[PDB]
Amino acid sequence: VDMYIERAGDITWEKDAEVTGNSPRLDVALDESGDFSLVE
């Protein structure tokens, strides 16, 4: 399994960028396997 990397761009902030998405406030737990879950 050849895993490899290839450059995809420079890391810069874009002025006048598209703004999208909401801002959810979620109660969550993190288990020892690195999985987040929603608390019921």
């Binding site: 895993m3 890391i11 874009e14 998405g21």
Partner: protein
């Protein structure tokens, strides 16, 4: 080892698949553990070996210790520098929500991209990487929300 954002690819018999994304900074490659599981990475003619990682944080670094230490300020909009499979890198600005946990609040972005976008950097207004995209939750309507996952620079 040139600074920038990189696709993480796998090649099998015919053709490549993008399994993730990562950040080269200060000679260290940074991605999410679930992208590589610590496998060595070919870079041009060279090889990058895992140096540090943590399953619970879902992070791994290559060539040296974790270097990214900027933190979300809890207030400002951020940008996901999304590098989706088969698509050019693009910046998406958003106001994070919050994962509220028993161990504190973590910023979280309600932006949904293919699995192979995992490891794409999230940026503050100065262009510093405040974390990586791709470890998150699916909410009741099916939408995805990613933690802003940041490591510790020791």
């Amino acid at each position: 080892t040139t600074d920038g954002v990189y696709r993480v690819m796998t090649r099998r018999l015919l053709g490549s698949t993008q399994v993730g994304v990562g950040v080269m900074q200060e000679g260290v490659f940074h991605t999410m553990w679930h992208v590589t599981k610590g496998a060595a990475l070919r870079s041009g003619e060279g090889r990058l070996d895992p140096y540090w990682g943590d399953v619970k944080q879902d992070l791994v670094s290559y060539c040296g210790p974790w270097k990214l230490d900027a933190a979300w300020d809890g207030l400002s909009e951020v940008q996901l520098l999304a590098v989706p499979p088969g698509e050019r890198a693009k910046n998406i600005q958003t106001l994070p929500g919050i994962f509220k946990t028993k161990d504190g609040d973590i910023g979280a972005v309600a932006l949904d991209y293919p699995a192979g976008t995992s490891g794409s950097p999230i940026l503050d207004k100065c262009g510093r990487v405040i974390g990586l995209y791709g470890n998150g939750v699916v909410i009741k309507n099916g939408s995805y929300v990613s933690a802003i996952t940041q490591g510790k620079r020791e």
